[PDB]
Subunit: 219 residues, 6 copies
Amino acid sequence: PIVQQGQMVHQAISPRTLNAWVKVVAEKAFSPEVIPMFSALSEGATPQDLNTMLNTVGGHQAAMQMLKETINEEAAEWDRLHPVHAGPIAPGQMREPRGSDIAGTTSTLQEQIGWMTHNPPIPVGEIYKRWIILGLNKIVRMYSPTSILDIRQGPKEPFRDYVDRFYKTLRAEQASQEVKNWMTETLLVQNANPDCKTILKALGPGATLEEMMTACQGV
Amino acid sequence: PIVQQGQMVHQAISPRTLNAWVKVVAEKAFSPEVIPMFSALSEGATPQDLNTMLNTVGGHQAAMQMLKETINEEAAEWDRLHPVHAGPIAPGQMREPRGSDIAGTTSTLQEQIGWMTHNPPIPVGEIYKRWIILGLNKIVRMYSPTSILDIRQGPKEPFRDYVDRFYKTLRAEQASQEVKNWMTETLLVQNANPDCKTILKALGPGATLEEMMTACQGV
Amino acid sequence: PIVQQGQMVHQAISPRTLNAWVKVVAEKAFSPEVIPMFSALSEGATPQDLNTMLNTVGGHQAAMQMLKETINEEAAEWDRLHPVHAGPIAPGQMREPRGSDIAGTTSTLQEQIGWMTHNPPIPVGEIYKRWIILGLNKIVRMYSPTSILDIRQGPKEPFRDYVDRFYKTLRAEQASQEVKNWMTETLLVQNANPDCKTILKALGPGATLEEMMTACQGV
Amino acid sequence: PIVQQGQMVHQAISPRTLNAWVKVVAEKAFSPEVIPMFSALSEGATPQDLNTMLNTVGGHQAAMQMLKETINEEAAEWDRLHPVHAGPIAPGQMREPRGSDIAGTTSTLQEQIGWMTHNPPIPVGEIYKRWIILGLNKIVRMYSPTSILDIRQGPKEPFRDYVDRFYKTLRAEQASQEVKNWMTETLLVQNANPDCKTILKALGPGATLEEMMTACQGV
Amino acid sequence: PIVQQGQMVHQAISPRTLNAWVKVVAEKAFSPEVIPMFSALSEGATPQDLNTMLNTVGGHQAAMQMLKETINEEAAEWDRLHPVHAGPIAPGQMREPRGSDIAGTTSTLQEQIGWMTHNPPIPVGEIYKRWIILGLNKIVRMYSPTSILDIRQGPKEPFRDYVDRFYKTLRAEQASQEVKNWMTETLLVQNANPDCKTILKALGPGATLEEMMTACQGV
Amino acid sequence: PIVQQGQMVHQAISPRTLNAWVKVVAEKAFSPEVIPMFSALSEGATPQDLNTMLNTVGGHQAAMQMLKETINEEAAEWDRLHPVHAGPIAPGQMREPRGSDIAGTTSTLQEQIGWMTHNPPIPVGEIYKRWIILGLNKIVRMYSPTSILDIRQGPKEPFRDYVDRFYKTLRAEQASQEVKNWMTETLLVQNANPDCKTILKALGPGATLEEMMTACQGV
Ligand SMILES: [Cl-]
Ligand SMILES: [Cl-]
Ligand SMILES: [Cl-]
Ligand SMILES: [Cl-]
Ligand SMILES: [Cl-]
Ligand SMILES: [Cl-]
Ligand SMILES: [Cl-]
Ligand SMILES: [Cl-]
Ligand SMILES: [Cl-]
Ligand SMILES: [Cl-]
Ligand SMILES: [Cl-]
Ligand SMILES: [Cl-]
Ligand SMILES: [Cl-]
Ligand SMILES: [Cl-]
Ligand SMILES: [Cl-]
Ligand SMILES: [Cl-]
Ligand SMILES: [Cl-]
Ligand SMILES: [Cl-]
Ligand SMILES: [Cl-]
Ligand SMILES: [Cl-]
Ligand SMILES: [Cl-]
Ligand SMILES: [Cl-]
Ligand SMILES: [Cl-]
Ligand SMILES: [Cl-]
Ligand SMILES: [Cl-]
Ligand SMILES: [Cl-]
Ligand SMILES: [Cl-]
Ligand SMILES: [Cl-]
Ligand SMILES: [Cl-]
Ligand SMILES: [Cl-]
Ligand SMILES: [Cl-]
Ligand SMILES: [Cl-]
Ligand SMILES: [Cl-]
Ligand SMILES: [Cl-]
Ligand SMILES: [Cl-]
Ligand SMILES: [Cl-]
């Protein structure tokens, strides 16, 4: 990656960053929290470091292939929006990146460093990471085994566990924020057990989650 | 985070900081000592690092949602107290942060660095951490299974263990310091077993905890 | 290795880089993901560091000997393409590297540093790593126990597992990218079980992997 | 903490310093060797780092409360010896610390850094650590289960084990150095078993511990 | 060791370098791969660091004594080839090292640093490491339990395992490279089982190891 | 410790140096290899760091007390050889250290840094470490359970194991180097089993250990 005196300098990906990413992939598969962890382990990463993290994953090659196809889609869109201009690269300049250059497959490390350190900067690492996180979200949604409509509180289930399952599945839903606002507004109280449901209905339409869980505590 | 020559510089969150936070969350849930540990693992953290630490938590999504609602409350209050002034941002200045900018959801990393390194500084990281610690305290209080009024010394319980339970629950109470002074002043001696209670009454109203535990040692 | 102020400086290979490489070799043998991991653990490595990583491998001496022979082939080709010019090395210059100099067996550490830090640079470390990765690919292909033509979906096998095996073996194939495009275009749908095969045929010749796996999900 | 070019600079407490302190507290309770370890893990620590180390301790809240009371005693004494002078803080100066400022509860991190880096320095971190180590010594003495007068050599106990127990308990005694000189001068030879006691009496009043243990070796 | 701005600076040997060397010695005894690992863990090491690594080895004191005798032989030879010149050391110079000075037993750390940082340099660390690696090779050869003449393929043994044993023992042989070329040229095909031996004879005298192992794959 | 631009700077003792020293003390007691490890973990250490390493040792308080007495002996001798001169310390100078100042009990950290960084330097850390290593050698010799005169080869014992035990005990002897030369010259061949003893007698008085162990290999 590249780390900030003021100047930005490049260093290799660390052994325990590699081992941490491999470990979390091997242990957690494609649970939603893997996406921030990835984004955490790839701060300021070049496309070479991102390809390094993706390639060190053994197994799950169906999901990794889907990730390849998503990356290729975003690269093709970048090529459509950024048409290349023919002409020799002048002294004191650098060529404009293509879709495959941001993906790190047709660009050297020195070119990526040059794009990322220029003023103004061309952040190929954050663009590539954006595409990767897009594909990862597609995979997390695709591998989720539950739907938010099926989360229903059991007759003896404590309210805290029901809310845990509900917002876990809701985190795996990854629909828009307004759709999630509606899901929280309707399904959570709607799909509670009769007692807790009655009490939550008695709370009112503008109750917070803290008040809702406090109301059904001893229940 | 940002680390201090004199100049403050930015670096990525470390792999063992991430793994340490994930580990302590997975092992200790929401015991009070998790709050300082968090504050320890996020020294000089940007809002991006704080969101990184919060998002890498799998499970406990009810508590994390309550934390989201608390953060949104504090952000709305910040917006109420700091009304934004319309006008183009002049060369040599930066826009004033909104509530969602301090929360890191509507501000880039460069903007957070700029606010945090300016003279005078706008410490968005410590404000956001303040809100987060507020919500975490709400969660710790909400998930505490015991009340300080129910802590009573057993007939054969050593005094040290009773004081341990008492001040553990008292730490989970998180009422004001004067209320805790009164709780220590009344309940501790009041709820001891008859023998130790008699001896502590014989000590006097101004005895220290060291003297109280010394008095009921062999007892 | 050599790490980037701007100037490139040299430091020793780290203990946990060594232990990480030894560990991944001992645990994963010659699975394809070992090649990027290697390339990850040897960023900016000198030929001395690469020889260090190769020599610390105990066992697998057949594969390591094959790697030696591949390295010698690439070195002989480098000598054929780069004939050495006789003459004394002038003050302010350095000799041009031979095949064995890039392989680190006839060149000192100071010579490798000098080649790698000169302007223009002679990247002996990346050339040697290129040869090493070539031989490693030969070994990975040679030790693969399965062929892509034998990957067939079971009558009760979920489609995701079948695609996992398919693209794992395909990753071990390491034929050209167009040949792999044809393999994906023909064998994947061709070798599915009758039900999923019928549905995929109904999808159309231009369906993505995401659409194909979505179609055979409940199936 | 603050680490030494010449200038003293501040950095956050490290994850493995935190985990090391938490681990040693969880494993060793309040054995005497915990006090140097603490002092080792808090070299150059600010009051914020010391409060961080104390607050991350879960359980043992009786001892931690006693530590709070000791710290408050030392702070009150500091306030008695250092009366505050009223007046506005002049440009180029900083206010003088109170007892609670050294304890880190009423002083910001910037104020602690300013006191610790000024010439002449006001070492609030070493003063606070001094108070903390005082309270920790009180706790170690209070939780010691044995008294030095009860350490007596068994009829078949090797002399080395007896001396081990003796100086362990003596380390837990923490009386003045002259009192410990007398304890070593009298009890050690006095409380040995009859044979070893006779031989040590035959050694003479000025024998070293090496000579004493050599004399009762084969015995 | 000493690590490279440009200037070479000295630092202490790291705890995990020590623990790594102790661990690999305790686990792998004197397998050939211990020699590169050693050379890896002692890059740029002073004679003091090398003596540190050798002295921390508990047990195997026969091999360590043999290593002492080899080091003394090489030191005596260095003294024979480099006779010392009598005379006072002039201001701006340093004495020439003896055999025991390179071995670190009669030279201080400052003298070793001075020799290693001078221009032109006297690399006492690499000379001492050269002697140490010589003795280590003698020990590895002496503790090898097998001879290359006894490696014979079993009637049901896969060819890959036979080549593994063959080149393992060959690595333990450590004869000259031409002798090893002859051993590979004769014994490998000569000592294979009848079927594989017939096929390898049918391959021809100029076949690579890759072709030889490919020929006897299904066999 | 203090680490070398050129200038020597001070930093705190590291958590894994502490944990490494505590671990090796807990696992290996007082085997000879603990002394170099100690000397390895305390390179450039101040007297405060050395006292830190000694004080963190729990248990073995008999040996630690003997170490205290040895340190006090060496300090008293230093005071006898270096009489203190009365007079005020002039501006631009520092007081000369006493025995207890080198031991770190009557000198602050700043005084130790000042002595260690002055030109010419007063290396109080290496003097204190010298005394500590002296006492540690006394303890290692005192706790050795075997004498070199009792090491005798068994009738079926391989020669390598016998030499291992012999030089282990010899390392624990710690007599002068000429006495050890005589012990190797006489006892090793003298105390071998009859067969190996006959063969070694047939070797001659000037045989190396390599030749001696080679002679009794198959025997
Ligand atoms: Cl995996
Ligand atoms: Cl370009
Ligand atoms: Cl662009
Ligand atoms: Cl963009
Ligand atoms: Cl509940
Ligand atoms: Cl569920
Ligand atoms: Cl969790
Ligand atoms: Cl702005
Ligand atoms: Cl503001
Ligand atoms: Cl503010
Ligand atoms: Cl008690
Ligand atoms: Cl309780
Ligand atoms: Cl292996
Ligand atoms: Cl040259
Ligand atoms: Cl060239
Ligand atoms: Cl090239
Ligand atoms: Cl499926
Ligand atoms: Cl398969
Ligand atoms: Cl604890
Ligand atoms: Cl002030
Ligand atoms: Cl003051
Ligand atoms: Cl003071
Ligand atoms: Cl004894
Ligand atoms: Cl006891
Ligand atoms: Cl060992
Ligand atoms: Cl000299
Ligand atoms: Cl020389
Ligand atoms: Cl030389
Ligand atoms: Cl085979
Ligand atoms: Cl074998
Ligand atoms: Cl111990
Ligand atoms: Cl002074
Ligand atoms: Cl002196
Ligand atoms: Cl001296
Ligand atoms: Cl033997
Ligand atoms: Cl023995």
